[PDB]
C-alpha cells in the first residue's frame, strides 16, 4: 500500500499507453457502490475522455464515468449508460461522487458537493469482482485495448470507493474532506501499478 494523500496522478500527454491500474481487495461481486473522485482537466471543452473505467472479463465498461463533449457527464454500469447533462462547464478541479444500487437501480451523481437528479439504471445487476480498474484510459477489453482519443489528459486523485451507496450526509463529509474510511478502495492505502509516462505529483486542489 501507499499513502497517496495530497498527491495525484498527472497525465500530461494524450496516449493509449499512459494509465494506472488500481488493485481492489474485492471478493464478493458488488450489489452497490460509491466512487468519489477529484480531477482537473481542460479536455471537457474539446473531446470526450475517460474519468473512471471499471471493466471485467465478461463486460468491459462495467462501471464507467465519462465526459461527452456536447452533453456532459455520463455514467455506465453493466454496459448501459445514463447521461447527466451539464451543458455549461468551467475549468477547475471537479470533485464528483457516483453511487448506484442494485436493489433500486437508483443512480446518484454528485458534482462539487451537490447532487444531480437521482436517476435509474441497471436495477438488479451484479458487478463482477474480477475488476480491472484503470485511471487515465477507457478499456475496450479487460486491462487493455485503450483508445488514445478517450484517454484523460490532466490530473486525478482522491479516488475512493465503497461497497455501498453513501448518504448525502456522508457525501458531504467526504466533499468537505473530513475523516472517512472507504472499505473497497482507499486512497491512503492504495495498491496500484503505473505504466507509461505517468507521474505522481502534489495535488492542485485544496
Amino acid at each position, epitope marked *: *500500500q501507499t*499513502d497517496m*494523500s*495530497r498527491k495525484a496522478f498527472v497525465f500530461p500527454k494524450e496516449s493509449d499507453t499512459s494509465y494506472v491500474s488500481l488493485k481492489a*481487495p474485492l471478493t*464478493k461481486p458488488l*450489489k*452497490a457502490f460509491t466512487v468519489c473522485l477529484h480531477f482537473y482537466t481542460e479536455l471537457s471543452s474539446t473531446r470526450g475522455y475517460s474519468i473512471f473505467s471499471y471493466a471485467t472479463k465478461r463486460q468491459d465498461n462495467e462501471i464507467l464515468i465519462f465526459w461527452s463533449k456536447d452533453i456532459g457527464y455520463s455514467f455506465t454500469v453493466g454496459g448501459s449508460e445514463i447521461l447527466f447533462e451539464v451543458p455549461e462547464v468551467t475549468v477547475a478541479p471537479v470533485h464528483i461522487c457516483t453511487s448506484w444500487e442494485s436493489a433500486s437501480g437508483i443512480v446518484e451523481f454528485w458534482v462539487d458537493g451537490k447532487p444531480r437528479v437521482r436517476k435509474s439504471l441497471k436495477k438488479g445487476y451484479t458487478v463482477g469482482a474480477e475488476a480491472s480498474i484503470i485511471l487515465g484510459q477507457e478499456q475496450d477489453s479487460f486491462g487493455g485495448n485503450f483508445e488514445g482519443s478517450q484517454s484523460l489528459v490532466g490530473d486525478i486523485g482522491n479516488v475512493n470507493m465503497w*461497497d*455501498f451507496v*453513501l*448518504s448525502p450526509d*456522508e457525501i458531504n*463529509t*467526504i466533499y468537505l*474532506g*473530513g*475523516p*472517512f*474510511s472507504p*472499505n473497497v478502495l*482507499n486512497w*491512503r*492505502a492504495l495498491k496500484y501499478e503505473v505504466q507509461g509516462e505517468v507521474f505522481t505529483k502534489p495535488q492542485l486542489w485544496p
Partner: antibody, heavy 117, light 110 residues
Framework: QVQLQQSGTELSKPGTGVKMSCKAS????????MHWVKQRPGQGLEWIGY????????DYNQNFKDKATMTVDKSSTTAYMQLSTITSEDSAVYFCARSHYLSWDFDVWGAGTTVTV | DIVLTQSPASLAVSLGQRATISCRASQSVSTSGYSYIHWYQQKPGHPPKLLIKYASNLDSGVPARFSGSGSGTDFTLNIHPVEEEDAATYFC?????????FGAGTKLEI
C-alpha cells in the same frame, strides 16, 4: 436508549459451534456497521471483523476468516457471530460494538458474551 | 497490518497527578491533518468506553482531564489531574485500514 444487548454466557465443548447475538436497540440499525471484537481474559483486544447490515457484507481479521461468520437480521435488528469448531483457545469475552459506517471508532458497545470452551 | 505498540504496560499514579500513556504506530496514520487513532477506557467487568477519537477529539460525556495528542507514528493520552475514577485499562486503536488493530493496552493503577 441506544444500546447493544448480547445473549449472555455460552458454555460449550471442543468441536462444537456457538452463535451469539447482539440486539441493537434505539437507533436505525441500517445506518451503522456492527463490529465484533475478542478479548481473552486479562489480555488485550482482538478485532474479529465487521458486518454492514445495509449490504449484508462482511470482512474479517485474517485470523478469523474461517473461525467466524457474521450475519444480521434487519427485521429484528439483531447481529450475530457464529464460531466454528471452537476450541479452548477460543475462550474469551466477545463484544459487539457500533460504528458510524464511514468512521471506525467503536461508539457504543455491548456488555460482552463470555464463551468458556 | 498496522502494529500499535503501547507503553508502559502499567502505570502507577497518585491521585491529582498526570498519567501519560503512549502508543506507537508502525506507520504514519495521519493524513490531511486528521489522524486515525482512538483511545478507549475499559474498567474490569465492563466493556470499553471510547475516550478520544482521531488522536485528540474528546468524546461527549468525557471529562476535560482526558486529553489525547500526537501525530504521525507517535500518540499519547494524558489524564490530568489523574483521579480515582481513572483506575482502568487503556487501549489505542487505529481506523486507517482493515484489519483494525488494538494496542496491547496499559493498566493505570493508583
Amino acid at each position: 436508549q441506544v444500546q447493544l444487548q448480547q445473549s449472555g454466557t455460552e458454555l460449550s465443548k471442543p468441536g462444537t459451534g456457538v452463535k451469539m447475538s447482539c440486539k441493537a436497540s434505539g437507533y436505525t440499525f441500517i445506518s451503522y456497521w456492527m463490529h465484533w471484537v475478542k478479548q481473552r481474559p486479562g489480555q488485550g483486544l482482538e478485532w474479529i471483523g465487521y458486518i454492514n447490515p445495509s449490504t449484508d457484507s462482511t470482512d474479517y481479521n485474517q485470523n478469523f476468516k474461517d473461525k467466524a461468520t457474521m450475519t444480521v437480521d434487519k427485521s429484528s435488528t439483531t447481529a450475530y457471530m457464529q464460531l466454528s469448531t471452537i476450541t479452548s483457545e477460543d475462550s474469551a469475552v466477545y463484544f459487539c460494538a457500533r460504528s458510524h459506517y464511514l468512521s471506525w471508532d467503536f461508539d457504543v458497545w455491548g456488555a460482552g458474551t463470555t464463551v468458556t470452551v | 497490518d498496522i502494529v500499535l505498540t503501547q507503553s508502559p504496560a502499567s502505570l502507577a499514579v497518585s491521585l491529582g497527578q498526570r498519567a501519560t500513556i503512549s502508543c506507537r504506530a508502525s506507520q504514519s496514520v495521519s493524513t490531511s491533518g486528521y489522524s486515525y487513532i482512538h483511545w478507549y477506557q475499559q474498567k474490569p467487568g465492563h466493556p470499553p468506553k471510547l475516550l478520544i477519537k482521531y488522536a485528540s477529539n474528546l468524546d461527549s460525556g468525557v471529562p476535560a482531564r482526558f486529553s489525547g495528542s500526537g501525530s504521525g507514528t507517535d500518540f499519547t493520552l494524558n489524564i490530568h489531574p489523574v483521579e480515582e475514577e481513572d483506575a482502568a485499562t487503556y487501549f489505542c486503536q487505529h481506523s486507517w485500514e482493515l484489519p483494525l488493530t488494538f494496542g496491547a493496552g496499559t493498566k493505570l493503577e493508583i
